[PDB]
Structure 1
């Protein structure tokens, strides 16, 4: 197959780290990305905790437990099948926000528990301390006095909002310590560094209640991820040249280079000006690493 990117305007696609529309892109004004969601090669090989559907982003699933005066969740994949530690740092879709407080909303998910009554709850999960061990299959839940009815029950959890850990700032580039003190989590997606030639990594942004820093950056729109998995197009050069074009006239508004590892770069600040957010990325051709933006 010939390589391509989605022919969908940027502002109709989802962030890959939270399920929110993209409302911008930017280079970092400071900070190394090693996100575990939104990670895929250009030839369609998923990495980290990344999966296909935006319906999976920043969610968890598992059975709530209570032991030794502490609550937690025994994790599974979002479809209810078991999580195998060999395959990934955590179950697919697991939030990749580290060293912070994850404020989750959850619902019972067993049909037999969904015939009557309110199946919903909320809970805080720290993405820190040794009891945060999703690679080992478990995470601690903060006791809010409203978890007892859910002990022994299977639930699905979604990330509602995020706040800083007491004594620390909220760092959206922090990598969660998935393997606790036991091991480095298997199959972590690697850190990304810019290649040179004045180039800077591009982040796609969404406004989201990461309180104190409500702009979540990711390295690929989720629909790019599913596109590459669908296509499995062979990588045929150092970089894929993209033009970001006017959605109606197809005039080029700016050039980008996508690298095989699954991220893109630009040379920013080429006269003050602002790119619109409703443009469309179009694959032009494979180009050498020396292509100058």
Structure 2
């Protein structure tokens, strides 16, 4: 079964870490040397990793039953379909947000007998001591729902931590899933740019971020729709890296070459300390050319 990537223009596809259209590609020497995102993680032969869902309907979602306690209210987590969360299969429930070290402003709705405005709750989930999604619970501020209420929660926007230990949001980092009690079990492994002059390609989307280190932008390593494609195809990985062309869909012109590694991420070689894929159009399609060795030398992409 031959390997392929979707024949879909980039700017029609979603970020795999927030539900937002891709509007740019970038490399980052500052942030792109090690990356351990937990969403948008899947092998080229279609093995899902981390908390990564097949569908965007699960992404940046939390489901749980409300608990009321002295130190504050919170949620006892389930999977989004309502089935039980287990602490062996993953760092958190599938689709749980993976943007660390920031406040999450979220919208929750009652899943049973939804009456209207009073069954929608604008809540704040902080990443402090009682943030323990791996153990099956998070503390939630400004949550007025009664005990044992079943809620589906959606990420609305993010902002600097409430406890003031930093004043910006760095979306390149992931949460501490097990709190200070333990490291999470099935974390999608760290990624490093392998290869000579290679930089990891990050697909960017706009999102409401207050004081972001790259402003209102969230990076990921695959479009969401690629994840569903690889999980569908399960094409055997027949080489060390997949050579791709980024191609204009009308003119058929090759706009640059890229390597996709089995771990499920892409790299390019920037032109002489340049911005690499950022100057390319965003309405192109990636296309599989051939399996190549990890040492295969890419032609530089972008301006100097």
Q: Deviations over 1:78-132 (max 9, x none)?
A: 111111111100000000011110000110012xx225664211100012x2200
Tell me: CA distance 1:132–1:116, structure 2 relative to 1, closer, same or farther (3 Å). Answer: closer
**Local SS of the residue matching 1:227:** helix
Report SS of the residue matched to 1:70.
coil
1:63-102 residue pairs with structure 2 within 5 A? 63-102=65-104
- Cα distance in 2 between the residues matched to 1:215 and 1:200: 19
Matches within 5 A, 1:44-63: 44-63=46-65
- 1:232-251 equivalences under 5 Å are 232-251=234-253
Match of 1:276 in 2: 281
Of the candidates 105, 108, 112, which is equivalent to residue 106 of structure 1? 108
TM-score (normalizing by structure 1): 0.94
CA drift of 1:69 comes to 4.1
Change (3 A) 1:215 1:237: same
Q: CA deviation at 1:65?
A: 0.9
RMSD: 1.6
Instruction: Indicate how the Cα distance of structure 1 residues 30 and 149 shifts in structure 2: closer, same or farther if over 3 A, else same.
Output: closer
Q: d(CA) in 2 for partners of 1:277 and 1:150? A: 46
For 1:162-204, what per-residue CA distance to the aligned partner results, in whole angstroms no more than 9, with x for missing partners? 0011231311122211011222101001111111211000000
1:217-228 map, 5 Å? 217-228=219-230
Distance 1:148 1:241 in 2: 52
Structure 1: distance between partners of 2:196 and 2:183: 33
What is the CA-CA distance between 1:268 and the residue it aligns to?
Answer: 1.5
What residue number does 2:144 align with?
148
Cα distance 1:161–1:116, how it changes in 2: closer, same or farther (>3 A)? closer
Instruction: Give the equivalent residue in structure 1 for 2:200.
Output: 201
Relative to the length of structure 2, the TM-score reads 0.91
Tell me which of 19, 38, 41 is aligned to 1:39. Answer: 41
Task: Kindly indicate whether residue 287 of structure 2 is the aligned counterpart of residue 292 of structure 1.
Answer: no
Q: Structure 1, residues 43-63: CA drift from partner, whole Å, max 9, x if none? A: 000000001001111110001
Matched, 1:163 2:159: yes
Structure 1 gap segments, 5+ residues each: none
Q: Distance in 2 between matches of 1:148 and 1:115?
A: 15
Task: Flag structure 2 segments of 5+ consecutive residues without an equivalent.
Answer: 299-304
1:16 and 2:44 matched: no
Partner of 2:301: none
Query: Greater shift after overlay, 164-173 or 93-102?
Result: 164-173
What is the CA deviation profile of residues 19-62 of structure 1, one whole-angstrom value per residue up to 9, with x for unaligned ones?
A: 00000111014122110000000000000000100111111000
In structure 2, C-alpha distance between the alignment counterparts of 1:172 and 1:274, rounded to whole Å = 22
Distance 2:14 2:183 in 1: 29
Give how far 1:212 is off. 1.4
State the secondary structure of the residue aligned to 1:148: coil
Are the structure 2 counterparts of residues 87 and 120 from structure 1 closer, same or farther at C-alpha, using a change threshold of 3 Å? same
Q: In structure 1, what is the Cα distance between the partners aligned to 2:118 and 2:176? A: 34
Change (3 A) 1:197 1:116: closer
Give how far 1:210 is off.
1.6
